[PDB]
Amino acid sequence: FVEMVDNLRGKSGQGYYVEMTVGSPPQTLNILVDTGSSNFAVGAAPHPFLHRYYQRQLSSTYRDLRKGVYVPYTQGKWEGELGTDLVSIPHGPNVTVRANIAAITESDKFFINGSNWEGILGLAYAEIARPDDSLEPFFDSLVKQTHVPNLFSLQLCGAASVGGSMIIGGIDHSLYTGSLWYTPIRREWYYEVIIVRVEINGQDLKMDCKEYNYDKSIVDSGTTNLRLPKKVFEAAVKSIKAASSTEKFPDGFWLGEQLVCWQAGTTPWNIFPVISLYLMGEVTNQSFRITILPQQYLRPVEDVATSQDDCYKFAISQSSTGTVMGAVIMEGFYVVFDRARKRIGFAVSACHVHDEFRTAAVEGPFVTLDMEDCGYN
Numbered sequence: 088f089v090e091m092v093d094n095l096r097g098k099s100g101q102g103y104y105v106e107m108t109v110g111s112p113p114q115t116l117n118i119l120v121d122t123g124s125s126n127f128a129v130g131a132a133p134h135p136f137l138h139r140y141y142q143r144q145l146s147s148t149y150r151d152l153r154k155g156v157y158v159p160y161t162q163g164k165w166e167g168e169l170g171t172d173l174v175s176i177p178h179g180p181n182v183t184v185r186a187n188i189a190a191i192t193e194s195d196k197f198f199i200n201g202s203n204w205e206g207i208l209g210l211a212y213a214e215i216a217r218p219d220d221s222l223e224p225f226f227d228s229l230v231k232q233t234h235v236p237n238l239f240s241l242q243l244c245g246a247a248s249v250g251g252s253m254i255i256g257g258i259d260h261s262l263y264t265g266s267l268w269y270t271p272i273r274r275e276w277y278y279e280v281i282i283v284r285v286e287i288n289g290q291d292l293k294m295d296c297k298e299y300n301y302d303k304s305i306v307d308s309g310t311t312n313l314r315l316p317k318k319v320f321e322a323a324v325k326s327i328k329a330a331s332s333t334e335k336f337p338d339g340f341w342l343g344e345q346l347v348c349w350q351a352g353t354t355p356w357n358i359f360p361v362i363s364l365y366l367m368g369e370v371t372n373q374s375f376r377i378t379i380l381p382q383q384y385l386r387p388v389e390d391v392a393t394s395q396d397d398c399y400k401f402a403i404s405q406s407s408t409g410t411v412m413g414a415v416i417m418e419g420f421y422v423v424f425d426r427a428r429k430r431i432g433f434a435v436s437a438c439h440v441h442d443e444f445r446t447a448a449v450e451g452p453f454v455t456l457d458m459e460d461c462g463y464n
């Protein structure tokens with residue numbers, strides 16, 4: 088896996104991407120790594136934001152499936168033509184598979200102006216693939232056609248340029264410290280998990296644990312923030328404010344719309360609480376917890392011209408679609424998507440940012456009863 092270490096790049100807030108090659112002769116592309124979707128879709132036309140795009144007609148191995156796709160979002164979309172072609176990952180395993188590829192021919196509010204990726208690698212399951220679940224996702228093809236084990240792991244680091252590792256087919260011990268603990272994947276669609284308890288500086292937020300997963304909780308490398316359901320978000324914000332009473336901040340800061348600034352080197356990290364998410368464990372009545380330091384949810388904000396303070400935005404935001412463990416969370420941990428065994432592992436990342444006195448942790452076991460009732464139906 089030393090060949091795979093450090094194989095991801097990005098820019099602050101624009102995701103992590105991995106290099107891939109498609110077609111014969113091979114066309115090199117940078118592809119966003121997204122555990123929140125299940126299509127492999129690449130720019131196939133010269134949208135002005137793109138550095139590179141897939142040219143299907145130059146590939147001797149391209150096969151047109153004579154079928155279109157349309158993926159809408161709340162405001163945007165992408166649309167394109169379905170096909171298959173040969174695909175490799177230069178800094179992944181030494182194999183070449185025939186995968187489905189959506190050739191993006193028209194899009195709106197999908198690509199990011201300024202980014203250095205040109206497609207998306209959806210790593211979640213068939214159930215949420217478009218146009219329907221018969222369009223086999225990339226990883227399913229990799230596993231079906233090769234001897235690569237049915238798992239990948241992600242160490243997201245980064246800081247501005249970011250870096251990380253996607254270890255395909257295994258776990259790399261050098262990428263984490265302490266122990267790996269596993270939560271069940273509740274259902275194979277998104278990487279759905281169940282959060283069973285939440286503490287702030289060790290103190291229970293005291294909500295019905297169903298609130299934590301209303302209407303789902305997912306691990307999503309294609310979202311930056313920790314996103315929390317509205318009722319959970321308000322309790323957490325209330326509790327973080329209290330812990331940090333010592334200073335007052337604008338309403339807008341808690342909304343992600345305003346920064347908070349301190350003289351360089353004087354950020355009062357001590358007044359911001361650690362957040363603990365307890366996840367359903369592998370054994371009946373057993374759970375474990377992952378601990379988030381504030382340097383994960385207080386996000387440094389690049390350059391406000393002639394300001395030599397340290398300025399930060401709040402990287403916890405509200406969700407109406409359940410809890411989302413986005414890059415903010417994932418950057419604290421080495422995360423193992425153990426598809427073969429329907430489970431997701433967490434261990435403290437070897438590249439997590441340190442606090443002067445407090446230590447991130449993945450710890451257990453804890454006794455939590457009725458953990459199934461925490462799941463939303």
Ligand SMILES: Nc1ncccc1NCc1cccc(-c2cccnc2)c1
Pocket residue numbers: 100101102103119121122123124197198307308309310311
């Ligand atoms: N996984 C995911 N979660 C929320 C929204 C979108 C999404 N995936 C598709 C997608 C499309 C375009 C850009 C991005 C993106 C933008 C910024 C950071 N990471 C991913 C994600």
